[PDB]
Amino acid sequence: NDNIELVDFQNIMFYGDAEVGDNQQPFTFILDTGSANLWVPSVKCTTAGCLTKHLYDSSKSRTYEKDGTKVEMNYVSGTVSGFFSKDLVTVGNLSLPYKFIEVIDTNGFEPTYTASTFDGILGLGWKDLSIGSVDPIVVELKNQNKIENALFTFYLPVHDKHTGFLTIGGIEERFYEGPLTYEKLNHDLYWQITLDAHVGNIMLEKANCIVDSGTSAITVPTDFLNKMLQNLDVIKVPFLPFYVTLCNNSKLPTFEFTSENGKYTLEPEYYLQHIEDVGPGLCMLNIIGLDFPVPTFILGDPFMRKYFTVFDYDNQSVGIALAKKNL
Ligand SMILES: CCN(CCN)c1cc(C)c(OCC(=O)N[C@@H](Cc2ccccc2)[C@H](O)C(=O)N2CSC(C)(C)[C@H]2C(=O)N[C@H]2c3ccccc3C[C@H]2O)c(C)c1
Ligand SMILES: C[C@H](CCC(=O)NCCC[N+](C)(C)CCCS(=O)(=O)[O-])[C@H]1CC[C@H]2[C@@H]3[C@H](O)C[C@@H]4C[C@H](O)CC[C@]4(C)[C@H]3C[C@H](O)[C@]12C
């Protein structure tokens, strides 16, 4: 099993480095289990955002194969566009020829892009979620017998305490304590599982829960959120879907998610973000209201900071265990 060290940025997201090109051109990635394409900004990029970034130069790579098919990647937080290219992609010490998007326009991905220090996004989703039918990196690696299992694991960094690791091809007991519980996927192409969701007396039976490394909140159905916030002494920021609270607000609830197999809780300490700068003793909730057609929670970064997670393509399941507080 190889692994990629995960560095914290502002206790809100984390990044890992990988390389694209036969000359070791190094890039910082958001590692996103909710998307299925890899992209890097190109030397051909003519946007303000690209100015600050590590850029990909295919002319300097002898393993570069031209594709040139045009493509737009639309995310909830914005859009990037360019064209497909193929080159050798190196993750940890493993590599494979791989198809990815060479990005020439990032103006539709502002203000996210220029505000953060990542260069690109490396998707870790399922094939049918990809534009252009790209087999996921971990599936290809397994198929090429470079790893033991078509699986990867997230041991997330904890700001001012330890680094994290993305591990490819196998599970390591050092990352977690207690039992590891596998939850079957309820969807063909999302890392989504079925859990009963409880927050106080508010309950949602057999909710869709998407375990997602690229989202820096817990998302909650908007009706469920409105019920949670009733008489909670929290205040919404003008123009933005964020709520502010005293950090030691005694009413802040604990999320409890349950299956047949297990029980996962998320206490206020994991979903609060200190904002001492805005005022003393104030926190933002890392919780946003979001309605999917079917009632869904996204168990983002705040969930994965507490819980070590195993993404298993072969067994179409997500393993969940309490992350070790330190290595
Ligand atoms: C079915 C169509 N399709 C396939 C096209 N052939 C397709 C393709 C893609 C890439 C899809 O994912 C789009 C996407 O942006 N998916 C995101 C997850 C998501 C979030 C909210 C609602 C739905 C999904 C994706 O994983 C993700 O985390 N992304 C996309 S860019 C990013 C910065 C890495 C991050 C993101 O926006 N994060 C922000 C975010 C997002 C939600 C709430 C809070 C915050 C604060 C930030 O953390 C979806 C949902 C469908
Ligand atoms: C994904 C949800 C819901 C979006 C939605 O309600 N989608 C349907 C409406 C119709 N659309 C307008 C999208 C038209 C196209 C689809 S249509 O089917 O109509 O053709 C939207 C609503 C509010 C959005 C956040 C805030 O901004 C603040 C912040 C800004 C940064 O920059 C990026 C991060 C962040 C956290 C945002 C992320 C995300 O983005 C959110 C959660």
Alpha-carbon distance of 39 to 71, in angstroms, equals 11
- How far is the centre of ligand 2, averaged over its atoms, from the C-alpha of 76 (Å)? 5
Solved with: X-ray
PDB resolution in Å: 2.1
C-beta of 288 in contact with ligand 1 (< 6 A): yes
Spatial CB neighbours of 300, under 8 Å, sequence gap ≥ 6: 212, 213, 214, 215, 216, 217, 218, 219, 286
Pairing type for strands 38-41 and 94-105 reads parallel
- Tell me the two tokens of residue 233: 């002494």
CA-to-CA separations, 129 to 31, 260, 261, 297, in angstroms, rounded: 15, 28, 28, 19
| DSSP sequence for 151-203 | EEEEE--BTTTB-EEEEES---GGGEEEEEEEEEBSSSSS-EEEEEEEETTEE
The residue among 303, 316, 227, 240 whose CA lies nearest residue 275 is: 240
The residue among 231, 224, 225, 198 whose CA lies nearest residue 286 is: 225
Summarize the chain as % helix, strand, coil (round to 5). Answer: 15, 45, 40
Alpha-carbon distance of 159 to 13, in angstroms, equals 10
C-beta of 58 in contact with ligand 1 (< 6 A): no
C-beta of 285 in contact with ligand 1 (< 6 A): no
Position in ligand 1 atom list of the atom nearest CA 125: 26
- How far is the centre of ligand 2, averaged over its atoms, from the C-alpha of 290 (Å)? 9
**Residue having the nearest C-alpha atom to atom 23 of ligand 2:** 241
Query: What is the gyration radius of the CA atoms in the chain, in angstroms?
Result: 20
Ligand 2 pocket test target in 32, 288, 291 with most atoms within 8 Å of CB: 288
Other CB atoms within a 10 A radius of the CB of residue 10 amount to 11
CA-to-CA separations, 235 to 66, 239, 251, 255, in angstroms, rounded: 52, 12, 13, 20
301 flagged as catalytic: no
Ligand 1 pocket test target in 39, 73, 76, 287 with most atoms within 8 Å of CB: 76
Position in ligand 1 atom list of the atom nearest CA 75: 15
- Tell me the two tokens of residue 234: 């929290």
**Domains of the chain (ranges plus CATH)?**
1-173 (2.40.70.10), 174-327 (2.40.70.10)
134 HSE (CA, 13 A, CB side)? 25
The residue among 252, 267, 260 whose CA lies nearest residue 196 is: 260
Which residue has 């694991």 as its token pair? 153
Asked whether the bond before 238 is cis by omega within 30 degrees of 0, the reply is no
C-beta of 219 in contact with ligand 1 (< 6 A): yes
Contact 103, 46 (CB under 8 A): no
- The SS3 of residue 214 is coil
119 flagged as catalytic: no
